Design a protein around this ligand. Sequence first.
Ligand SMILES: [Zn+2]
Ligand SMILES: [Zn+2]
Ligand SMILES: [Zn+2]
Ligand SMILES: [Zn+2]
Length: 112
Amino acid sequence: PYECTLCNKTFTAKQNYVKHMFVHTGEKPHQCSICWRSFSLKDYLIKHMVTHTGVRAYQCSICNKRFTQKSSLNVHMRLHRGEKSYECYICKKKFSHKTLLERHVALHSASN
DNA sequence: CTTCCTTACGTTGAAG
DNA sequence: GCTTCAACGTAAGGAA
Ligand SMILES: [Zn+2]
Ligand SMILES: [Zn+2]
Ligand SMILES: [Zn+2]
Ligand SMILES: [Zn+2]
């Protein structure tokens, strides 16, 4: 029900509406006391502080590799699921089409 | 190729 | 019940 006069965007709650209008003001009052960069919202600065501490709190449950963020970990999860590959049950090689495995399995048949 | 690092939205749930 | 408002979640996309 909340709309931005400028960029014309609707928000569900008032919190994101109030924050969005402050970002428009360009003001950045949340400063990192290590590198002295400023940020418009505190939640942004909280994420920036990881670049100094080096903590990697977001660990994948599969390969156990840790990341600086959850967005970085979310996109990493798109790699543990991908296109399947057929497997010759003799030489254990992989193939990308069934008609390719049938032509290869038929090779093991002719010679033996 | 991945990952870092930035921003922008969202709902949930203590706490007045 | 009605307001925050912090702590998360989702995602995008150039930089490293
Ligand atoms: Zn706007
Ligand atoms: Zn800093
Ligand atoms: Zn993983
Ligand atoms: Zn084979």
